[PDB]
Amino acid sequence: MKVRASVKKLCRNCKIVKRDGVIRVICSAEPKHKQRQG
Amino acid sequence: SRVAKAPVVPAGVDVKINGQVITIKGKNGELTRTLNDAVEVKHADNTLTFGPRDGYADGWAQAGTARALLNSMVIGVTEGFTKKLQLVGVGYRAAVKGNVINLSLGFSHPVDHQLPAGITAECPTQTEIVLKGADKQVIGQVAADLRAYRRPEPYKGKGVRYADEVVRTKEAKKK
Amino acid sequence: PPAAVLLKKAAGIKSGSGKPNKDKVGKISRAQLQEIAQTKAADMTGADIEAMTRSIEGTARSMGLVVED
Amino acid sequence: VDEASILVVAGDGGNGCVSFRREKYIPKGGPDGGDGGDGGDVWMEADENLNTLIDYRFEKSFRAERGQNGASRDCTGKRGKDVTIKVPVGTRVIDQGTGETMGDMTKHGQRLLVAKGGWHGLGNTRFKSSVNRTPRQKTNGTPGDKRELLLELMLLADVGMLGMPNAGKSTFIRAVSAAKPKVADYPFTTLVPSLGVVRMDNEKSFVVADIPGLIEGAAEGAGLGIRFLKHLERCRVLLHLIDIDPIDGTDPVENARIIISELEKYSQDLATKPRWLVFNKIDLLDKVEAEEKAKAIAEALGWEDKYYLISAASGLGVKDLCWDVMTFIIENP
RNA sequence: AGCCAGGAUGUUGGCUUAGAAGCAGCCAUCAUUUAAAGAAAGCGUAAUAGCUCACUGGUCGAGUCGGCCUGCGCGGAAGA
């Protein structure tokens, strides 16, 4: 997780999950990539 | 959709209508209930039909759900998905000892948890555990709690995994 | 023996170009090619003799070998 | 494999006083307090493990402190600091600035200071010649430390095993070691090699490093490929596997001459230094015969680069010797 | 959307490289089989292999997939 005011999927091993006001980009292959907010 | 407006239910399973409680009754499991908040129950007893109670736009969110939940009750009283709960790694207890199991990492306290019905087990092994089905939700929520007492650790992948396979040797490249 | 192999052996060069087909190193005769296509006919799941001929010609052309009697 | 050169920066100079003395009674004073900062230097630490990848991290090098000022309530400001650098698994230190090597090691828990500071801000007193009034300053000179250091592991991690297409390096290291092999990671501008841990039977353990990714032996011509083969040849210590069994497929006498000659050809100095020969496939030998041959080849070299033994057997002072080759590799040029 | 597959065959095309042969770099990227099957996307592998898959038939069986402009909302959002 990191502080980022831009959401867009990085690889297809990021998928965009919306938990309201925080939007993560964890995927099965790579939950390495992760965001906090959005 | 083609599932929130697209519906059978044999004779072994029967239903006790309420406004968005679907109470099922049947065999091998009965008296099962799960609620929504925006579906009318239409009776049919041949897969009951669903959609908005009064007109809502969250009522097909609830219709496809209520659909599958009904169907999950059907499968539930014919035993659901949880039927195992393995764990990768050796030298760690994981047999069934009555209602309690045990688990180790070299733990200086027993690690165990009792069994309610609907998830009863017994194995002859300390690696595999053979559980029982029941209502799909119920078994799944207790199934999670089991594995949660030592989630996977991935450098060799050891750590008590779920009913499904959720391990991967997703190491940090180090030993 | 592959078609790929067999046409390089018949053309007498064992190496390819640095850029195959945009550069050629040797050439391979349709007489060789027809017969290799017959041996490799067997190894094909083809329905006819022509089928094999095209498949083996296609292997020559891409390894930087000309296809010409 | 890669070798690296770090740029390390320490703290830096102040920023002089913006100050006036404030009174309700008396209108405005001068500056009290002043500048701030200064900054420490570069040091080095040497370590057995790694065992947290901070070299597959890398961000783009070593940064540190800018100075201070203060003003509320008549203030100066503090100092900057020293930066210290960690590697995966030992380093031998050189500095591009000296152009040469300082300390010689890959001896762990050995630290060395490459020392400078004396960075200062521009204060009100600097301008002064006992006439000046400069109440307002907020200003800095100086840049914090700059030096290019040069680190080399001694590589692939400290020692690089360079077989031949008869090799079997990992299996033998596991036989001779009750220690596990790790996958190591290093500060490489290339892929990051396979690490194998060696027992030094002293209640310390040392690691030996083998071919990029899966092994192939450098002599075969691939390290995992030409690219890898280029990563692999770089190690300062190179190791020569033979199968000192009656079998080697390319016979042991011949093999030993060809590997030893190629290393000589490349640099005679490498043969004459603490670069090793390691006798292997003694998982097919009891090591009394192996030991003799290991020892004859070694002595016949006519210089330092004698014999290492890998793959366990006997107790002819052999455990001591295994530990000794590793010690010799550690002591470094 | 999903599901069954074919998933073949010259073939795993070659240079480079021991192996880089759809998928490091460099270039080919042709052709066959059938109602269908790409010298093959990614993962994975030095690279292939494999693994799955845009490729394409069958299946469930009817509407469905993305652009363009637009109303009004949302996240972004820390102080004694």
User: Domain of C43: which CATH number?
Assistant: 1.10.10.250
D198 CB neighbour count, 10 Å cutoff: 24
Q: Which residues of B touch D52 (CB under 8 A)?
A: 174
Measuring alpha carbon to C1', the residue closest to nucleotide E32 is C51
Distances (CA, A) of D228 to B17, D156, D236: 70, 11, 16
Q: Which segments of D119-193 are extended strands (E)?
A: 121-122, 139-140, 147-152, 160-162
Whether C16 sits with its Cβ under 7 A from any strand E atom: the answer reads yes
Report the candidate in D312, D326, D53 with the shortest Cα–Cα distance to residue D183.
D53
Angle at B8 between CA B5 and CA B11, to 5 degrees: 140
Residue with tokens 């009394």: D288
Residue B130 burial (C-beta neighbours within 10 Å; 0-12, 13-18, 19+): middle
- Judged by 3 or more CB pairs under 8 A, whether D touches B is yes
Nearest residue (CA) to C1' of E76 = A5
Pairing between strand A22-24 and A17-19? antiparallel
Range of the domain at C42: 1-69
Report the C-alpha gap between D311 and D170 in whole angstroms. 10
For residue B111, which phi and psi values (nearest 5 degrees)? -125, 115
Strands D307-309 and D277-279: parallel
- If asked whether residues B97 and B57 sit together in one domain, one would say no
* Residue–nucleotide distance: D86 CA to E49 C1' (Å): 40
> CA nearest B79: which of B139, B130, B10, B32?
B139
State how far Cα B102 lies from the chain centre: 22
Cβ neighbours of D212 in B, within 8 Å:
none
Give the resolution value in Å: 5.5
Q: Indicate if CB(D165) is under 7 A from strand E.
A: no
Q: Which nucleotide is nearest to C61 (CA to C1')?
A: E30
Residue C29: CB less than 7 A from any atom in strand E: no
**Interacting residues of B78 by C-beta distance below 8 A, sequence separation 6+:** B28, B29, B133
When divided into structural domains, chain C yields a total of 1
Share in percent of chain D as helix, strand, coil (round to 5): 20, 15, 60
Contact B174 D185 (CB under 8 A): yes
DSSP state of D219: G
**H/E run at residue D85:** strand D83-85
Residues from chain D that touch B173, judged by Cβ atoms under 8 A, are 53, 183, 185
Residue D142 and residue D12 in contact, taking contact as beta carbons nearer than 8 Å: yes
Chains C and B share 3 or more Cβ pairs within 8 Å: no
Residue whose tokens read 């077989």: D163
DSSP chain B: --SSS-----SS-EEEE-SSEEEEE-SSS-SEEEE-SS-EEEP-SSS-EEE-SSS-SSTTHHHHHHHHHHHHHHHHTT--S------B-SSS---B-SS-B-B-SS-SS-B-----SSS----S-SS-------SHHHHHHHHHHHHTTS----SS--B---SS--------S--
Whether B174 sits inside 8 A of D51 (CB atoms) is: yes
**From which experimental method does this structure derive?**
cryo-EM
Burial B116-127 (b: 16+ CB within 10 A, else e): eebbebebeebe
Answer whether residue B43 is part of any domain. Answer: yes
**Angle formed at CA D206 by CA D203 and CA D212, multiple of 5 degrees:** 155
Distance of CA D75 to the CA centre of its chain: 43
Distance CA D6, CA B162 (A): 46
Q: Do B90 and B147 share a domain, yes or no?
A: yes
Q: Which helix (H) or strand (E) holds D194?
A: strand D194-199
Distance D230 CA to E30 C1' (A): 35
Looking at the domain assignment, is residue B55 inside a domain?
yes
> Closest partner residue to B175 among D52, D53, D181, by Cβ?
D181
Q: Are D185 and B173 inside 8 Å of each other by CB?
A: yes
Q: What is the CATH number of domain D159-331?
A: 3.40.50.300
Query: Structurally, how many domains does chain B consist of?
Result: 2
**Is B126 within the bounds of a domain?**
yes
Q: Which of B54, B79, B104 is the last residue of a domain?
A: B79
Q: Please give the residue range of the domain that contains residue B145.
A: 85-161
Q: What residues in B contact D47, CB-CB < 8 Å? A: none
CA pair distance D50, D108, nearest whole angstrom:
12
Spatial distance between the Cα atoms of C46 and B150, rounded to a whole number of angstroms: 57
Other beta carbons less than 10 A from residue B169's beta carbon:
10
Which strand E nucleotides have any atom less than 7 A from protein CB atoms? Answer: 1, 8-11, 13-20, 24, 26-34, 39, 42-43, 45-46, 74-77
The CATH number of the domain where B112 resides is what? 3.90.930.12
Domain boundary among the residues B48, B79, B110 is at B79
Say which nucleotide is closest to residue C14, CA to C1' distance.
Answer: E14
**How do beta strands D112-114 and D42-44 pair?**
antiparallel
Q: Which residue of B has its CA nearest to D50?
A: B174
Task: State the residue for tokens 């023996």.
Answer: C1
Q: Which nucleotide across the nucleic acid strands is nearest to C44, CA versus C1'?
A: E9
Residue located via tokens 């090691």: D105
Length B171 CA → E66 C1' (Å): 40
Which residue in chain D has the smallest CA separation from B171?
D183
Question: Quick one: which of D91, D5, D95 has its CA closest to D330?
Answer: D91
- The pairing of beta strand D139-140 with beta strand D121-122: antiparallel
Q: Is residue D180 less than 8 Å (CB to CB) from chain B?
A: yes
d(CA B165, CA B156): 15
Residues B94 and B74 in one domain: no
- In angstroms, the CA D327 to CA D333 distance is 13
Is there a domain that residue B169 lies in?
Answer: no
* Single-letter amino acid, residue B138: V
Residue at which a domain ends, from B25, B44, B79:
B79
Distance D224 CA to E47 C1' (A): 10
Claim to verify: residue B129 and residue B92 sit in the same structural domain: yes
Query: Rounded to a whole number, what is the distance in Å from the CA of D125 to chain B's nearest CA?
Result: 55
Mark B6-24 as b/e (b = at least 16 C-beta within 10 Å). Answer: eeebeeebebeeeebebbb
